[model samples]
Target chain A: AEAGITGTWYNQLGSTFIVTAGADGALTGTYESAVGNAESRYVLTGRYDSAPATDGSGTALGWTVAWKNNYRNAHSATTWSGQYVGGAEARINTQWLLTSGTTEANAWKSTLVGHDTFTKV
Target chain B: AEAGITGTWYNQLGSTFIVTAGADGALTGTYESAVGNAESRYVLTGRYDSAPATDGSGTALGWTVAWKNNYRNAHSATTWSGQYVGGAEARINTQWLLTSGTTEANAWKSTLVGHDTFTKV
Candidate 1:
């Protein structure tokens, strides 16, 4: 079983997501934020639907990172859902939802939505 | 003088481009390819048009990396030309042209063109 989403990826905002797909469809990785005060590596976990063929692509996957309280701005949990497209140019097109911590005072800023295209490194 | 492009960036192909913009508008960096046999860090040089404000964006920049003859597939020189956009999410959007070495016989594959949106890390 070739896990298609195994490798290092970078988002548009300069964040790094390193993923490791297990044989049992379990996904694990680390998310490194490129901005904000919480600029550290955080653990992430999730699962995938189907593994793409070797060097090929076509897998729907999702992962989540529960940010640690290492910094004042580290009060968010983000999940990315996307598909891996492979070829000469392999990439993952994903939509992310970042839900702030329960302590968030304002509902407007409680959730943040964005799109990210992760380029395979 | 703030060089908006000074930092580490990753492309869609998972390639890493670390840049250092000098006060004189000159740019120097190292390019690490995510794919291919020539995956080592290659030196790059170029320049920028304007410097963006601190933590801000808006600079037209360009850079070039000459692939070394370290491997059989290491026969291409790539150049990236793009602009930096700043805000909560800073990014560099650029077009790249990878020109093959002169020793190559095939002209069809001599030049490769692509677009890369690099996220600052």
Candidate 2:
């Protein structure tokens, strides 16, 4: 409708990730684990929410916080089911940390579900 | 160490959606919501969790479950954030339904914060 066809998009992430005022915020991440069935691949990408007391925009602003990532799935002729559910509620988070260069390092400490949207490029 | 060229990957999906085992499992999904930041773009792609209670594998066994999708971000020179926080927790799930074929539908009714892995690819 707007652009010629909405082809591709490329941009650098601001802070890499965001933080929230929840359980996963700790260095150890959520007291809850990042568990789910197998199939989809998830990675904590970045943070973009601004809270009332937090700071990331350079200045002090009360911005909403959330995280971003790269999620991919590969299924076969068969079928399966799973999710990336969290152990917290809506609140404020700050950032993410992949445990000792582990896979979960992309884990963002946040309760920011729905804070992101797929930019089909 | 592992797969040197293990930097990219390719694959296909079975069902674009999965029936999770919690709130986001039902066709209608959890009553909660898909609330988060403003950067991430989430899409309901496929399911990969085997369950003795359901059929998709053509058979019936207890296969752990999970999901998959493509996640990309282009945060500008500036920082802004969000999340895909669901309204459920760990359990068997089925599938995901789009909201009037809208964005929210990509919302998986799951507490699956940590199940999928990030393939370097």
Candidate 3:
């Protein structure tokens, strides 16, 4: 699929996607295969925040990317909480989790399950 | 239960916990009941980050606090990607997620599903 994101991103699973960012730092991205999901393709949209949110002091840093595939029930949400800058180009060396929805009342119970990394190219 | 944490903190769920930050900024806390779960109590431990890994810039902020219940299958993980500040006190106003694990490999797939706020008293 054509990348909505400007550069290409590859996960350790060997899945790939193209992401493009706007001047506002809002990004619309696409991947041929849903990350760690059974779906064949998916679309992603999110932004980079330069301010502290309710849970942190902007000291830890956070970015959220929400994605979904063909299944209306198959929704994936991820938040990267930990990050490490590899000497030169940055690497996504941190903690990330994804969870599908259950119900409005049961939503907060969802938990993060895995990890992935991205680098700017 | 006595609070292991230095102060008392509560979530929207009405659940409460006591948290104390160490000299290193690493925190160890406990809740007689989980932030949201069926368990009787939980213990939380985590730290604040001043930088980012793979997500966004410290501009967004991030903090992770992990908790576990008595059940073998029951685990709760929550990360605060946002925070806010008030005059005499502070508040946690941001996005958060929690996921239970099926297997160790199923960890990264966990998704954040709810919101909460905390204030320092």
Candidate 4:
């Protein structure tokens, strides 16, 4: 089977998530955001479970990128949860939660949510 | 490298998520819930991203189980987001969101959240 989740993925926002897969399920990647830190590549950490199928398709994935440089807010982190749907055209359907480092009395207001579909490039 | 996220895993709640990974990132599994349907197995679907690392550790994953048989509620689905941490003893650290089928004006109250650490069995 081909390396399922390895390579470059671009989201709707035009940000790029470049990934390399490890045999142990560890994910190490770089995110070049078109929206934030446009000139810098942010490091990312996360996990995957593709063992449910031999083809490595229908993978459940989650990852987080902490914005530290040239961001709207330096102390915020965005975590994404997604599924990789494979076919002639492979895609990752994802939802994200961006949480601020600053504490808020209303915790719900301290975070933002959104969705993105990433296509392998 | 051994199949990273394949095989059986048991959570703190004693629920078992038996998974198999396809090359296309598709996850197929059975979720045997100790807390809900003790006598039946629930089908599960999800995705994974192990491509960020060659070892497949730190893999990001997510899955969902819809309750239909002898469940606390008939119309509900529980989704889990997790990372596969490989080591001397592999583990999946996960957070879950259980949502009800019934429509509620207060969507926040209609869902419950919790955490679980699943160990390979």
Candidate 5:
């Protein structure tokens, strides 16, 4: 229960997991990932926005999340952000969209989200 | 009508996929998807809170409803949690986003959201 880390991870399928923030906790990062038949290897980049241990007492910053697809596609280049409630644990909502889909698929979606608690680790 | 069991789902379209309570109610399961040649699956593990006979009744214990990317990421262990209000057929708010990435990417997001509508199963 300390803080959170803001970043991105690429893979072999689905949307390019993008994240964002609202306040000063906004970070920006991206990576390169290849899509295989059924394997994923991700390398994340960015700051620790929770405590001094994760991102030196930082808050998340980004636009509102909507929704996106999770299978049979590739996240070409995307970005995201968010904020911290300051605690050992944190809860928040999210959304995703089909930024880029194969052929003619406009991937998009929304969800009611959150964590069990906001921690101050 | 019975109660509820609104839980997790994936890549679903629309905003009113009401997660109600009771027997023959909402279900908690994973999803099947793909990203290019990559294969992704999202599953959920939680209870159906505010069971039926309480779509907002305020006098029952039921299945807990939550969220999933409906894509590849469902839980950190691959799972998410949320709040409990009114009842089955009721509405609760939530938020979430960017925890990690690999570049200058503000990789997180948020939203005060809910499944909307308490239903009587």
Candidate 6:
């Protein structure tokens, strides 16, 4: 089941997504957004839980991302247990959520933050 | 003019923000968001550009973060040129922008992403 993590994956603020992995790695994607105002798109579903390094530096590869912002009807979710790289697994650290339901009371959020990263295309 | 990055700074998903640096470092903060729904708060203002490393690893510390979802009327912005720390400066790497304007067409953007990070408290 470690044979997953397919196609383009570039997110370090530049924008790029197009995944397809399912053998238990469970991830289907299409997150293409550039930044604020009028440009938004999402459809990422997540799970890449495999590695687990407690710091002693062993196995580590766990991400849980979720995006559904097909624009307005927005829905953002993210949860990456951890990721950091230079070799291009793309580096990560997330816990973000920006909401929609027409905000105002639906509560627009952007918390659970780790700063940001993603690269593999 | 390198002497301002005041108060707590903790983000790596755990959430924490409180800065007040303005001697030219230009930053004013209060990004207290925990992550989506029910708990939403933001009022961070940006700038901290001082270091610039082209990878040769010379001087580095540049971050630009903005938030204003006082719970609605929302807004978000970020631009971190570089930061890879581990001596308590925390860690960072960003370029995010999550939008709002009632989503849907106001474009609920969460693009221009760089995974996430922040630390210094």
TM-scores, all candidates, are 0.43, 0.16, 0.45, 0.49, 0.24, 0.24
What are the Cα lDDT values of the candidates? 0.56, 0.18, 0.54, 0.60, 0.27, 0.51
Higher-ranked by lDDT: 2 or 4: 4
Q: Largest lDDT belongs to which candidate?
A: 4
DockQ of 1: 0.02
Q: After superposition, how far is residue A34 of candidate 6 from its true place, in Å?
A: 31
Ranking by TM-score: 4, 3, 1, 5, 6, 2
Per-candidate alpha-carbon RMSD to the true structure? 18.2, 19.2, 10.3, 12.0, 18.7, 15.5
Candidate 1 predicts chain B with a TM-score of: 0.77
Please write out the lDDT profile of model 6 over residues B38-70, one tens digit for every residue.
Answer: 446555555654554445442344544455454
- Quote the lDDT for A15 in model 2: 17
Which tens-of-lDDT digit does each residue in A1-121 have in candidate 2? 1121112211123212221322211110111113432322222111121111121211111111111112321111111111111222211221221111111233233112233211222
Ranking by lDDT: 4, 1, 3, 6, 5, 2
Cα lDDT of model 4 by residue, B78-112, tens digit: 56665566767888766665544222233335456
Residue-level lDDT of model 1, residues B1-121, one tens digit each, is 2355688888767888888877744566678876633457666655454323333324545555545424323434455545566656778766555544222134344455566788865
Q: For candidate 6, lDDT tens digit of each residue in A1-121?
A: 1342567666656777666756655667666667633446556666664554445342234444455443454354655554434332434444444333345444324343334556565
- Judging by TM-score against the true structure, name the best candidate: 4
**DockQ scores for all predicted structures:** 0.02, 0.03, 0.32, 0.05, 0.03, 0.03
**Model 5 chain A lowest lDDT segment of ten:** A97-106
Candidate 2: C-alpha RMSD to true structure equals 19.2
Give candidate 5 misplaced runs (Cα > 4 Å): A1-121, B1-28, B34-38, B54-121
Where model 4 places Cα greater than 4 Å from the true spot, the runs are A35-38, A54-57, A70-73, B1-121
Each candidate's interface RMSD, rounded to one decimal?
17.3, 17.4, 4.3, 11.5, 14.6, 7.5
What tens digits encode model 2's per-residue C-alpha lDDT throughout B54-100? Answer: 21111110111111112332111111111111122211212211111
Worst 10 contiguous positions by lDDT, candidate 6 chain A: A83-92
True-vs-predicted CA distance for residue A78, candidate 6, Å: 9.3
